[PDB]
Specification:
The structure is cut from a larger assembly and holds 1 copy of chain A (about 280 residues), 2 copies of chain B (about 450 residues) and 1 copy of chain D (about 230 residues). Chain B is of the alpha/beta class and about 450 residues long. In chain B, about 45% of the residues lie in helices and about 15% in strands. In chain B, helix 8 crosses helix 9. A two-stranded antiparallel ribbon of chain D has the order 1-2. The chains are: A mainly alpha (about 280), B alpha/beta (about 450), D mainly alpha (about 230). Chains B, C: Keywords: Cytoplasm, Cytoskeleton, GTP-binding, Microtubule, Nucleotide-binding.
Amino acid sequence: YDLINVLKHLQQIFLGYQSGHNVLKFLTKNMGELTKHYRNDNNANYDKLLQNFELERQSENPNNLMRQLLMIQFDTETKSAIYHLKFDINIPYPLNIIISRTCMIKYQIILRYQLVLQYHSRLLDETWMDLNKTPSWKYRRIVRATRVLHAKMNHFIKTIMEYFNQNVIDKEVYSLEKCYRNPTLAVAIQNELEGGLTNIMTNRCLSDLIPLQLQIFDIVYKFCKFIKSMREDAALELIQKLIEYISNASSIFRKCLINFTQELSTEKFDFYDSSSVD
Amino acid sequence: MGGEIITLQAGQCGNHVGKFLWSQLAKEHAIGTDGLSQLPDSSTERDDDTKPFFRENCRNKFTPRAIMMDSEPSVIADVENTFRGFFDPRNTWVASDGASAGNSWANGYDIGTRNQDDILNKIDKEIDSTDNFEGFQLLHSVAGGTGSGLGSNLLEALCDRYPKKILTTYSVFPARSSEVVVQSYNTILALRRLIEDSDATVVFDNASLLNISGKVFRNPNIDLQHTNQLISTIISSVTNSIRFPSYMYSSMSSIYSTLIPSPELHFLSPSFTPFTSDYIHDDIAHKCHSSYDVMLDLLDPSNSLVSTAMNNPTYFNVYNTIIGNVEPRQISRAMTKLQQRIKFPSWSSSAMHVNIGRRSPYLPLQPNENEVSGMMLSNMSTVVNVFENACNTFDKVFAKGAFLNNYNVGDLFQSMQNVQDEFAESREVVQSLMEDYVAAEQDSY
Amino acid sequence: MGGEIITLQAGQCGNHVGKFLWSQLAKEHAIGTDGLSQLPDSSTERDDDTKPFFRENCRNKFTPRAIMMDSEPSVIADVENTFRGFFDPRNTWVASDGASAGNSWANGYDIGTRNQDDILNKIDKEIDSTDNFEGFQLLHSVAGGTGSGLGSNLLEALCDRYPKKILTTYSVFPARSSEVVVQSYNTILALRRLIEDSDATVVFDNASLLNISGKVFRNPNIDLQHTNQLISTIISSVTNSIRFPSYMYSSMSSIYSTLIPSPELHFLSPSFTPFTSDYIHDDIAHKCHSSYDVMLDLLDPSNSLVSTAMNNPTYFNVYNTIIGNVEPRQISRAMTKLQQRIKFPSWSSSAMHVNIGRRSPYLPLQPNENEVSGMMLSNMSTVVNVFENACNTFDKVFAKGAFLNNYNVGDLFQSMQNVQDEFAESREVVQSLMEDYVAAEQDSY
Amino acid sequence: NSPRNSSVINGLDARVLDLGHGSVGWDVFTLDYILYPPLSLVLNVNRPFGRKEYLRIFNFLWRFKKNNYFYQKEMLKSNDIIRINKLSRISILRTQFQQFNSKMESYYLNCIIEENFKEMTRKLQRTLNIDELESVHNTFLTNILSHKLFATQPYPTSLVLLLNSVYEFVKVYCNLNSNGLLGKFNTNLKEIVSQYKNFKDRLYIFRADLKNDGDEELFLLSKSLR
């Protein structure tokens, strides 16, 4: 029935640890549509990208398991797409007995966070690569502020991605593999499934980073959107407005360094609150 | 399909390492001497190295996505072998002139202008043939006629023509001490193109490379071709994670973004481990993470001769360390957390200490022993000691007013000899900015 | 059935290219070197063996429907060969009343007039076996004595005698430069008749054709015989839709009717990719459907220079893409949508699309392969430049006053060559007119 | 044992069956295929449904071919010179009109029909019941029903009007060869050009529709008619 092979396939899609190229190219198409919340047309386009990808890989078989059985879902509105996305699985047989409701939900969640990190990184890179080129610079100090803040943010996201992949994914997978080989028994698969649901479940409880992070990403999206415009009295006024925006972002980032040593930045929580009511 | 890459090979050195490089990948990905697959490789699944680096005739005959430029010698070596049929012969261009490059920049450059059209056609054809072109890798020599002169033109052309795609260079700097008096002039002229026309440059210093090749590998009579074997090994391994699926953090763009945050720094130095496992008759044994980080700082054991003082206590702008093999990460993470705190380089309090780490495994298309290995990619201020030395020699040839002549006879240098002076002045500015970067003073605070 | 075609072969070249054509049709349709059928089932109406290029005897020895005019040499070579019996000695007319063309058009045109009836008898016999005549193909070279004069004479007569049928000529042009000046005389007198009396003319520009022969075939012993093998592969591919009507979206007559914008523009240029061996090593070059698709768009292998391969700033009147070999259709449509959208050809102010493609498979009587090939046949307004050149050469020659004596006997040319002066004004009006069609004035209300 | 022993030699008889009589034979025409034992007790019933469907498709194809032959015939006759600057002006207009319809016909055959039949045959080869025939046919017929309903409601409307306009020109053209003929010919020429320009604008919306595979704008145009 060749269970072993399918297990590897599962580790590939559900765990998502070998689908990188596809997530990147999935994000690039329909970037604007995802930034916003659900609109009807959003959906048509999103579904097209799905139908195209189902044509593009898996030809290792008469019938693509990955492509066919797994599709990605969007929730209807008429906040942002990113929340509204979920990942959906259509069930096989007799393999279906193994899989359980809880398990698919666990996987869909690692995929969503992963995906979240992934879109932000792509956007951080494209903006910087542009900025290194001649047209954005030189028709003084303000330039230097944009350069430093950008370098620092890239660092922060890469350190995050290292910890998220090592400390979570690499660790759990390492363990999963042992459990299947060492004991080759049916009992060993049941044990392992339980292990696969945990550590993601612990990690969920330990890390609850994303809403804060997300606030900072929106400020980042705005910043970068402005930076893309390139080349008097107006510029300077606008610069001033950006400058207060930068200091606040700089002060939270300064607080955030402390968190890596020992968790929680009061300052970012405190900025949202202040905005709620001072 | 993939983010496809065109490799451009220029000069004797560039053609020698470039040919070897394809030979290593062919061994690694179990294919022939013309990329012919063996029977278990016509089975389902192999690594996705294939479409970025390679193209298919789609009969399972893989071909390198490489462009060869030189004159007759290097091309003749490829033709004698079964590596001529491996490589697409249209991507290979061979020219001469009645007044050839001759290991002088000006001749290589005048010829470059004549065949401006020809090179751009060749390039556009390969670009048109490409799906999802990510960018270019230039492989070359500054001890080349071709690699220097022809190379300087192509760098200029690539700058103007397309600004959208990423340009990376692997530039080999001479082995050891001065070979000809006019060397500083040849070197600065190529170096001009390299600062302005490229987004990123990986410097491979032959002197450093040679020390390893003579001593470690043991060559009683050493040569450039022998050293190039090491370089093709360094370049290939650095691409291992790109070619190895499960990685997409290995990615050229995310690496670039993290490493390079202004066009003023972009000179990379690599450091490497192992250099052992050749001609087995001595012990080969697995290192560990600490041992790996400690070897890299040493000057002639690392690939680059930057002329550092006391083995890099110098200002690091950024560090990325890439570890190869399976080994407990945790052990390392704690040790690394202490290594930044001791702080081997220098830093200012005007920027954070940014340290990145990448872990990459090995291909299962070839057998492994899982030995502790690594490459490091860092941007360091210490390279400038080399540039100062070049500048001094350059100032001195200028001052004498003698041996300016051979360049000056060509029309470009005859109309204006202003151009060299402008570059020297600029070059002093590049060094000045790198020095400012060591301090706090570098930004607006 | 399918509408019959008569080939007229004039001059050395036509007869040579014609012999080669026949071997190629004879192989493809699984018939002998005497047209004798292949005895086991090799043809059960899987294909329809082309009654347009053949006639059937009732021994069922297929014979080509062709008229050869030249002198003795080319016809002799066939007759020596076992290719005779796929010949007809009655169709064959050898000059013994030619007495030296001399490289003079007039001389040729005039010998043709003298032996009009015996010649007309070969043609009428061939016409009389016909079911319903599609039209004629004239194979010849221009700048010849024979190739020029006798073909032009025949064409004007055919024009008047049968005014309801198609006249196509496959014409070899010299170059867009001259080393021989009286080329221009031969070419201008012939050109009038070719412009009016042919409804289509396929230009093969001999400079361009030579490049293919020299570059691709790479034999130093090369001549016209060798080159003619490249013309015959090209000519045979254009005929695929007639010889195989079993392609139910490629049928020649209707295709011909559509593509033609009006006979005002009708100088066509071919291009082809890749190449089949005929005097060099086998085609082992396989590449992707995408690769195949890219290659058709490049005119970088120039088999004709009618000034569509120099530059494209005016507009393409029509483009037809000939695909040979079946290959995934779905893919062929997705690439095709990208090509119409991308708009590779240049365009006028009312024509922005008019590019077509036809797809046909290979016959299995040939050794099976999964390599794809294709031909481009296109009509472009750039052709006017060749006329412009022709006018420059024409003024030059007329300025020397070279050989006016032969012309003066003739009534037409009493006050020296009047016909050439008449033509000079006529050609300028047409060239201006083709330019107006690139611009807005083409539709004006 | 190829045609003599074929469906075409044996099987076809020409049929006349039509609702009413026109002023033309053409409308009235149909084609009859003789008894086949798969269907000697499957459609030999109170409903000859299977034979009606196939017929429907057959007609749509047949009208397109009938117009196609007329368009080649019309054009060919004109190359003769019947049936100054005016001559060139008409010659380009005629060719362009033929070119767009023809291009359209290329896309219908290639993109829908050839691709659907190909897929069907391979799927039969790669692998036995009556049903498998019916299924593959059904699938063919379904793709065509979907295409029919959205595109081909304007598209045949447009194609039939183009056919009339070419006959009107061709008819005018024979007459020319005094003054009265020239005055009429100039009027008719202007008229063909306004009708062409409006068609060209639709054509552009239509090109966009082939590229998206179905754009919005065409959707709107068809909805407005309806």
